[PDB]
Each structure stands twice: as C-alpha cells, then as structure tokens.
Amino acid sequence: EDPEGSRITYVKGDLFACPKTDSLAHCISEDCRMGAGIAVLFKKKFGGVQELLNQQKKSGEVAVLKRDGRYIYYLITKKRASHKPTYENLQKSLEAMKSHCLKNGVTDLSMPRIGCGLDRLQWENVSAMIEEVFEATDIKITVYTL
C-alpha cells in the first residue's frame, strides 16, 4: 500500500511563504511586463526583467531565473499583457517547465491558480492539464489562493 498522493495540493495562504526550497511558477507575456496581479510581487521579490527578456522566449515556452538555489518559472503564455492565453500555449509552457524540472532536480513547485482570474481560463481545465503534464513524474504542485 504505497500512496502516490494528490498531484496538486491546495493551500489558502501566501505563495511567497512556501518552503524556500520549492521552485515557483506563474504566467507572463512575451513582453515580460509584470504590472498587474501576482506578477507585481514576482517582479518585486525576484526582479530579472532584462534577464528574462534576454532569453527571447515565445508563447508556449518558459523563461527561468535561478534565485537562492531554486528556480522561478515564467510560463510565457501569450504575446502581450493585454492578450488572453490559449490552452495550447499554456500546455506547451507547462511541458517546457516540466522538462526543466526533471533536468535540474526540481521536485516541488508552488504556484497561484495559473491562467485563471484575468487570463480568463477555467481552473478545471488547467488542473486537468497540470495532472496530464506531470503524470509519471514525482513533481508535486502546491496551488495557493489568498
């Protein structure tokens, strides 16, 4: 009797108070503008705007910063901040993140309800997508809501 446990755990609280060893993820546009929502706090806490731009990542890719021995993943899901993401680009970006996690030994991720709220995707779809992308890995995801 060897319980895998849930892929996704839900926590009411502050994403940025997650374990310091967890990597973090959220969604941004190719323009790397982080002027609304939780992105504002990613910008304040981790910076990296020019470093991210220099990676020249496109929709469906992931830009990455290393901060304090773990990673901050910038899922590039749309071209511009005022646009809306497709599920297809979100999936591609998550796959990209997964492959980086696996290459770099990341086993624990924390994130908000990615794509949802202002990006106007439906959480039931995103959670299913996360489950599909991370199946057959031992990467656990904690999703934070204030």
Swiss-Prot record:
Disease: Defects in OARD1 are found in patients with severe neurodegeneration. Defects were found in an extended consanguineous family with several affected cases in two generations.
Originating gene: OARD1
Primary enzyme class: hydrolase
Keywords: Acetylation, Chromosome, Disease variant, Hydrolase, Nucleus, Phosphoprotein
PROSITE patterns registered for this protein in UniProt: MACRO (PS51154)
Species for this entry: Homo sapiens (Human)
Effect of G117E: Abolishes enzyme activity
Position of the signal peptide: none
Gene Ontology biological process: DNA damage response; peptidyl-glutamate ADP-deribosylation; protein de-ADP-ribosylation; purine nucleoside metabolic process
Binding site for substrate: L15, R113, I114, G115, C116, G117, L118, D119, L146
Tissue: Ubiquitous.
Name of one Pfam family that matches: Macro
Compartments it resides in: Nucleus, Nucleoplasm; Nucleus, Nucleolus; Chromosome
Function: ADP-ribose glycohydrolase that hydrolyzes ADP-ribose and acts on different substrates, such as proteins ADP-ribosylated on glutamate and O-acetyl-ADP-D-ribose. Specifically acts as a glutamate mono-ADP-ribosylhydrolase by mediating the removal of mono-ADP-ribose attached to glutamate residues on proteins. Does not act on poly-ADP-ribosylated proteins: the poly-ADP-ribose chain of poly-ADP-ribosylated glutamate residues must by hydrolyzed into mono-ADP-ribosylated glutamate by PARG to become a substrate for OARD1.
Family matches, as Gene3D superfamilies: Leucine Aminopeptidase, subunit E, domain 1
Catalytic residues in the record: K78, D119
EC assignment: 3.5.1.-, 3.2.2.-
Protein name, per record: ADP-ribose glycohydrolase OARD1
Entries under InterPro entries matching the protein: ADP-ribose_metab_enzymes, Macro_dom, Macro_dom-like
Gene Ontology annotations for the cellular component aspect, listed alphabetically: nucleolus; nucleoplasm; site of DNA damage
Macro domain location: 1-146
SMART domains attached to this UniProt entry: A1pp
A Gene Ontology molecular function term of the record: O-acetyl-ADP-ribose deacetylase activity
Control of this protein's activity: Subject to competitive inhibition by the product ADP-ribose.
Catalytic activity reported: 2''-O-acetyl-ADP-D-ribose + H2O = ADP-D-ribose + acetate + H(+); 5-O-(ADP-D-ribosyl)-L-glutamyl-[protein] + H2O = L-glutamyl-[protein] + ADP-D-ribose + H(+); alpha-NAD(+) + H2O = ADP-D-ribose + nicotinamide + H(+)
